[PDB]
Design a binder for these strands. Structure first.
Ligand SMILES: C[NH+](C)c1cc(NC(=O)CNC(C)(C)C)c(O)c2c1C[C@H]1C[C@H]3[C@H]([NH+](C)C)C(O)=C(C(N)=O)C(=O)[C@@]3(O)C(O)=C1C2=O
Ligand SMILES: [K+]
Ligand SMILES: [K+]
Ligand SMILES: [K+]
Ligand SMILES: [K+]
Ligand SMILES: [K+]
Ligand SMILES: [K+]
Ligand SMILES: [K+]
Ligand SMILES: [K+]
Ligand SMILES: [K+]
Ligand SMILES: [K+]
Ligand SMILES: [K+]
Ligand SMILES: [Mg+2]
Ligand SMILES: [Mg+2]
Ligand SMILES: [Mg+2]
Ligand SMILES: [Mg+2]
Ligand SMILES: [Mg+2]
Ligand SMILES: [Mg+2]
Ligand SMILES: [Mg+2]
Ligand SMILES: [Mg+2]
Ligand SMILES: [Mg+2]
Ligand SMILES: [Mg+2]
Ligand SMILES: [Mg+2]
Ligand SMILES: [Mg+2]
Ligand SMILES: [Mg+2]
Ligand SMILES: [Mg+2]
Ligand SMILES: [Mg+2]
Ligand SMILES: [Mg+2]
Ligand SMILES: [Mg+2]
Ligand SMILES: [Mg+2]
Ligand SMILES: [Mg+2]
Ligand SMILES: [Mg+2]
Ligand SMILES: [Mg+2]
Ligand SMILES: [Mg+2]
Ligand SMILES: [Mg+2]
Ligand SMILES: [Mg+2]
Ligand SMILES: [Mg+2]
Ligand SMILES: [Mg+2]
Ligand SMILES: [Mg+2]
Ligand SMILES: [Mg+2]
Ligand SMILES: [Mg+2]
Ligand SMILES: [Mg+2]
Ligand SMILES: [Mg+2]
Ligand SMILES: [Mg+2]
Ligand SMILES: [Mg+2]
Ligand SMILES: [Mg+2]
Ligand SMILES: [Mg+2]
Ligand SMILES: [Mg+2]
Ligand SMILES: [Mg+2]
Ligand SMILES: [Mg+2]
Ligand SMILES: [Mg+2]
Ligand SMILES: [Mg+2]
Ligand SMILES: [Mg+2]
Ligand SMILES: [Mg+2]
Ligand SMILES: [Mg+2]
Lengths: 150, 122, 116
RNA sequence: UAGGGAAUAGUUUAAAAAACAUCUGACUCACAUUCAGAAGAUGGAGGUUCAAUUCCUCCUUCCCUAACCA
RNA sequence: CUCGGAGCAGAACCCAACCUCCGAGCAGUACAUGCUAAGACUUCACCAGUCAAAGCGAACUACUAUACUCAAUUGAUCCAAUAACUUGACCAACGGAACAAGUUACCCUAGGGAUAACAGCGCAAUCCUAUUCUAGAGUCCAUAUCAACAAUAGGGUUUACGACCUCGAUGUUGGAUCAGGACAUCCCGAUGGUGCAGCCGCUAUUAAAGGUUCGUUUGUUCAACGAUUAAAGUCCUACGUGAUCUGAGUUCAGACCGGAGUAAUCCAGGUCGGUUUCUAUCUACUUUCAAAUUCCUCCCUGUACGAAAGGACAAGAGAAAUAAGGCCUACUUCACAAAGCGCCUUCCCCCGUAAAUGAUAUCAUCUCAACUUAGUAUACCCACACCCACCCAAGAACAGGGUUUG
RNA sequence: ACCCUAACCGUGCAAAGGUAGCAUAAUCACUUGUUCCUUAAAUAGGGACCUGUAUGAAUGGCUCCACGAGGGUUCAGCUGUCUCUUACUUUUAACCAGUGAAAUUGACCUGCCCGUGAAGAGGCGGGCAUAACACAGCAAGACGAGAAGACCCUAUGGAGCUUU
RNA sequence: AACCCCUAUACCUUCUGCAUAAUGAAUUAACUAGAAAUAACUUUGCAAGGAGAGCCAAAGCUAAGACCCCCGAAACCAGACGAGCUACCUAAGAACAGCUAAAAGAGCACACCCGUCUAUGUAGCAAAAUAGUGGGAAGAUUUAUAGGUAGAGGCGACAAACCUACCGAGCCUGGUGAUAGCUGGUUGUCCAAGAUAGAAUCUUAGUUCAACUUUAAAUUUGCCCACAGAACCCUCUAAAUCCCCUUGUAAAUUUAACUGUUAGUCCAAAGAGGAACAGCUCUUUGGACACUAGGAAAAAACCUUGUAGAGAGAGUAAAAAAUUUAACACCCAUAGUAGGCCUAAAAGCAGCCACCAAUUAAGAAAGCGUUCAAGCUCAACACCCACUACCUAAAAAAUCCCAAACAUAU
RNA sequence: ACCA
């Protein structure tokens, strides 16, 4: 948050730009054990806090009397420094991003899609899939998002 | 947790295109299935091992005939990844007491009631 | 090498109570059969179903177990439940799940014992 | 690192008192002693209890012990 | 350390953790909280625990009643007390031995790699490196240098963590000896940048052929200090190497001081003393290999370069040291000889870049364009008796040389 | 009483409140204190000072003659301890002749490199090497040999010792 | 055709798992290890009785068959035997040169006694030695002889010393085949069924019950599963489950009788702890392994695959790693004006506000710049097409790279 | 008073 704030506030035009947080402040406690301790002896003590973020979420939102080109530069800098894959997007680039994914799902010439096979348990494939894979449809592997997967 | 799987019923709703590829008649469904196990039950959960035994499919590549009815289809749906299902075809009708001893189940799924082991004269 | 701490959470070692339905829909019960055990009222007694002092639902007659959804009307002496319904918006009716036993046999028959 | 104990007037000890310090006066030529008055605290926060100086739980704080065998 | 409730464990039941939370070891009302009896539940066994129609007695006309509220609110058998009814454990290590603590380095046996200490392995939080980002510092200037917040990738040197091989033994910290390897380069070579005038620096690219001191101190690794040095590199090799050595340390039995304990004893707190076995069966290896490195002086030159102060470089010439390889004339230890402290000899390369010409892209452009430049061994060994014996600068034996000294 | 320390002041507590001495070390948080000697250089040794987590008076305290195969420091000399080894003698050795043990040993037709694997391979995978057999050396490996690990843990296994 | 070719990780034990560099084993011969009741079962006899007094009998009862190892501690106790060693003591002996000093537990130094340090030796010469160097050597000395003290003990200038070569308590015999929840052993052939929820426990290296597993018996459903049905508090509104006729199937329960298994690994999935480490630890649902075969290089746990023999037939399963990357416009620039304000000064470019006009066109200015200046680009004009693809950007360890190779025939 |  310190990196996001100082970089955005230092790089924005306060007269013609505003910025709002789209994530809450750290609220999830994270415990750590004393250095050098062995396994066991009860859970460790609360150390710091974090905010969970899922793929497809807006982290920070900007607007004002600017175009996308004006903010895309330093929004990409802050995004590149985030602990996950992130990207500066616009009201328009976000929509075309979603139209392109739906266009690919429609013109896909492969008769075999992850979803079709996994929903019908074809090949008994669910013996290697998570229950979550019925809705993730092969686009998610842990915390990673794969925009190429259809 | 790995569990038994519910298959959406849409999976078993054939489309007009499917009838063209495979050549079934939705208005005149076949009576009997030909079912062949083509895949091991090793490395499969026990409940699939059990249904393969109920269907008489313990030996691979060994055609069993079964009724094309909802109860049997319920079992065949659980092990549909272990098996090949084909319709039984009776180009010459059912065997009769006369020709019970002359049938052959051909690879095309047709049960012929006359098996001469001779070349077709024409 | 390092001295370690200790967990401050004691207790929590009781095992499951093994409570729940003992007789599902359509099952044949004899009088006395415990139909379901519970700690709170998930299922309420209906026709020919008694309740023990631990909220145990049991069969009072011999027959078939049914579960239904019925309108719930508390006893006017049950202050807490009556306080609930009095605050409900007009037109709102509470429902609970009830279990019943449909008796299978008649109470008896009239048979000829003498011709005197 | 891990356990235990302890925070009461400005001070030091009690179970909300006492002696000091302070304040007011008296005595003295003056000061001190002395005499007579007066104020002055339950570490903070969080509770319960009919009522919290012995009770919480936490914080803050200081201490005590232990930290061994290869 | 027993018992309940909640989560983990979302929906029949069940479900672990030195997991996350919260509770109980009672109170209160009764005095039919009397008797009896179908059918059932059940804490995964058992024991124990639970619910209940009908009936008998009661009670009885408006939630109560043949089974009180309440979640746990609890303890078997034996035995004891009692006329009988009935009563008795924080038996809390809570399925409960009727009643028993310490200490052992004076120790012993049985086992265990089911389990720790060494090493290996896993892992990489911690450590270390690189890159990405542009805040910031650097007078100005983000990028000569140095860097916050972060981000990504790597390494396997630390401290841990895990407990997978070895407890019918994988003994040893530091040192000696001999060193194999990495390159993340300390020095020597070649480059690029510079807040590079020069002399020195700083930073990066390339380079592992060659090298990388002696002392005082501590058992020491570490460090400090004295002298040097071109430089006194970082690491791995079972913290390389103990059937090669050492044993200061370390860590058994003896003893002392301080502390702890009633005492026996104990204390990664000090202190003094304390047995280091092995005849090599197998593998491996035993003249790779004759190309050499570095400093210094002179000189260039008080030149280049600088306002001065200062002050060099691919050359040129010497003289050394070390490392290899020999040798004995002299010296020295010695003496038909072997030696060093003495003497003699020692011979190529390396790539980072910097530049021409020049298209894709009619200029330019050193070019994962075609292209042109810097800029790619020799020496040694070598013929084959008898295989009597003798001799030898040859040699463990064998082999070799000589005998026209049998 | 600048700080340091407190002759001093207040209060409390105990049976008594550690006296005399002694203290950078058989003693040691900081610490290799500091200072004076000692060396070119000292985490050593000596003399002092600081002052005691936890020095201290027959559990003896503090000095001192003599003494000690005790532990430590040192002048001078001495020397192969070392720089840095060399030479010779005997022993051993090796060869001939005689006599003739031991531990050890699953079987062995018993290479190297990388990888793998019960996580460190002569024996597995992929490569590479490769006629056969004596003798002398060597000690890197054969987790070499020797002793059912003396460490550590476990066993309702022992034993010695001490006790409220 | 002996070898060359191809295939092939001794064995036993122990383990989650052993080619393991874990145990044991030179080899040969011989020796060397499952002992029995209760009940049940099977097969006879007799049968409301049986039995050759006793004891059983509501089909019993008699008889028979068939059944439960080996080696190993450290210890504990009883009674003997031990002081020719050694500890201490008693009686009665013996030795101690020379030199110095002269009171002598004085000095030097032999014999003699001891054992400091070094080396050697380590199945030795020796179950403690040898060589040198040492300490003492008229004394609390050393030593010959005989005798004494005895293991719950002695003796001790305490080292827990020594008491006949291992004394925290001797040795021998006996109790004694001590005991061992612990390790190691456990002997002919062939077939078959067979992998593990939990509870309690001075218990977690073990037991007992359950569970699973085996055998025999009885008689009847078992498994798979259709609707209908199983909660609110309040949803991560989960994958699922439970119940369950049909159906496909052949099991299931009960009765009798037992033992062994109750130290578990990886993989996928849902979680928990740890560091969203671990070949980590803990629950759960599956799978695999601890059982063959073929793949993934070797390879327990991934993929294919199961039922057994012979064949010099055949179809198949799983099964081989792909990828190559950063060029980029050319020109052109006058003017109100240094817009005011601010500021010592600000002139496009400190900061403040405003941002209009000139010429076809050039922002009261986007980036650099300075002395606030000046300068240098960019945005305009003119000429007139630069080619612009699409997103992109990495690497180092330690014995020695690692099959050989190959872009072309359906 | 306090054995189990
Ligand atoms: C950590 N502290 C508690 C401590 C520790 C040690 N030593 C050890 O812990 C040694 N530990 C081993 C045994 C090595 C494991 C210690 O040795 C000491 C001390 C405390 C100091 C106090 C010192 C203090 N001043 C001078 C700084 C002071 O005022 C006093 C006092 N009495 O008031 C001191 O005496 C003091 O100088 C001192 O002596 C201390 C220690 O000695
Ligand atoms: K071991
Ligand atoms: K030793
Ligand atoms: K000292
Ligand atoms: K000093
Ligand atoms: K001495
Ligand atoms: K060796
Ligand atoms: K191994
Ligand atoms: K092993
Ligand atoms: K072993
Ligand atoms: K064993
Ligand atoms: K046990
Ligand atoms: Mg001792
Ligand atoms: Mg032992
Ligand atoms: Mg292990
Ligand atoms: Mg380790
Ligand atoms: Mg190892
Ligand atoms: Mg390592
Ligand atoms: Mg484990
Ligand atoms: Mg061994
Ligand atoms: Mg080397
Ligand atoms: Mg080492
Ligand atoms: Mg010992
Ligand atoms: Mg003392
Ligand atoms: Mg003491
Ligand atoms: Mg000594
Ligand atoms: Mg020592
Ligand atoms: Mg040797
Ligand atoms: Mg004093
Ligand atoms: Mg001193
Ligand atoms: Mg100290
Ligand atoms: Mg001190
Ligand atoms: Mg004292
Ligand atoms: Mg005393
Ligand atoms: Mg004297
Ligand atoms: Mg003496
Ligand atoms: Mg001395
Ligand atoms: Mg000297
Ligand atoms: Mg070794
Ligand atoms: Mg060994
Ligand atoms: Mg052992
Ligand atoms: Mg015992
Ligand atoms: Mg005993
Ligand atoms: Mg193991
Ligand atoms: Mg072995
Ligand atoms: Mg073993
Ligand atoms: Mg052996
Ligand atoms: Mg006894
Ligand atoms: Mg003498
Ligand atoms: Mg004596
Ligand atoms: Mg003693
Ligand atoms: Mg002792
Ligand atoms: Mg003896
Ligand atoms: Mg035992
Ligand atoms: Mg594991």
């Amino acid at each position: 948050f310190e990196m996001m704030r100082l970089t955005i506030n230092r790089s924005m035009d306060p007269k013609n730009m505003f910025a709002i947080w789209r994530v809450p402040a750290p609220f999830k406690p994270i415990t750590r054990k004393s250095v050098g301790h062995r396994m066991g002896g009860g859970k460790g003590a609360i150390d710091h806090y974090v905010t969970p973020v899922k793929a497809g979420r807006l982290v920070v939102e900007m607007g004002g009397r600017c175009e996308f080109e004006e903010v895309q530069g330093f929004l990409d800098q802050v995004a590149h420094k985030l602990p996950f894959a992130a990207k500066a997007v616009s009201r328009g680039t976000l929509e075309k991003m979603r139209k392109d994914q739906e266009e690919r799902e429609r013109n896909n010439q492969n008769p075999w899609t992850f979803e079709r096979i996994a929903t019908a348990n074809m090949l008994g494939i669910r013996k290697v899939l998570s229950p979550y894979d019925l809705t993730h449809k092969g686009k998610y592997w842990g915390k990673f998002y794969m925009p190429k997967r259809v | 947790k790995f569990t038994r799987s519910r298959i959406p019923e849409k999976v078993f709703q054939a489309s007009p295109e499917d009838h063209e590829k495979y050549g079934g008649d939705p208005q005149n469904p076949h009576k009997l299935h030909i079912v062949t196990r083509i895949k091991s039950t090793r490395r499969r959960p026990y409940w699939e091992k059990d249904i393969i035994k109920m269907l008489g499919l313990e030996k691979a590549h060994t055609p069993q005939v079964h009724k094309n009815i909802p109860s049997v289809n319920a079992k065949l749906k659980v092990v549909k990844h272990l098996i090949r299902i084909k319709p039984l075809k009776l180009p010459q009708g059912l065997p009769a007491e006369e020709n019970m001893s002359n049938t052959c189940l051909k690879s095309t799924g047709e049960l012929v009631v006359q098996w001469h082991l001779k070349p077709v004269e024409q | 090498k390092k001295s370690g701490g200790s967990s401050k959470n004691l207790g929590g070692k009781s095992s499951g109570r093994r409570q729940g339905i003992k007789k599902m829909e359509g099952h044949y019960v004899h009088a006395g059969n415990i139909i379901a055990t519970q700690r709170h009222f998930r299922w309420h007694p209906g026709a020919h179903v008694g309740v023990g002092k631990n909220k145990c639902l049991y069969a009072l007659e011999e027959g078939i177990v049914r579960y239904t959804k019925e309108v719930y009307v508390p006893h006017p002496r049950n202050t807490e439940a009556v306080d609930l319904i009095t605050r409900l918006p007009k037109g709102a009716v509470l429902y609970k799940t009830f279990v019943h036993v449909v008796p299978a046999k008649p109470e008896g028959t009239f048979k000829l014992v003498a011709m005197l």
